[PDB]
DNA sequence: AGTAACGGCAAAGTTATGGGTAAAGTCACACTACGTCTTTAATGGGCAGC
């Protein structure tokens, strides 16, 4: 396979156009989610996710505290 | 005699209900409740009269 790569990418081109980075954005854009989708926010804690609690800053605002996002 | 409407056969689908696992969600560990005042009735001493 790796020759007959290397003859179809020598007649096709390469097609630069379709060329993507490795960057963090796309790594953010090739994430699952979960299968409820939703995690609720606990006081301190955070949200749980696969039986892991994730914090972040945002969270200790009232209005979002106690709520599934 | 051909065609559209009606109805039976049956499988396909729809909720519903009692099971299974897997994972999000709760909450107690944070020294700590048992404690005190009030109530009437019976009884048991000393104290006094006969």
Sequence with gaps: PRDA???GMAIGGSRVHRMI???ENFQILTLPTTSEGKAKVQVG???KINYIYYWSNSFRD???ENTSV
């Design 5 to 7: 790569f290397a003859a």
């Design 62 to 64: 009232p209005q979002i």
């Design 45 to 47: 804690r955070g949200i």
């Design 21 to 23: 980075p490795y960057d």
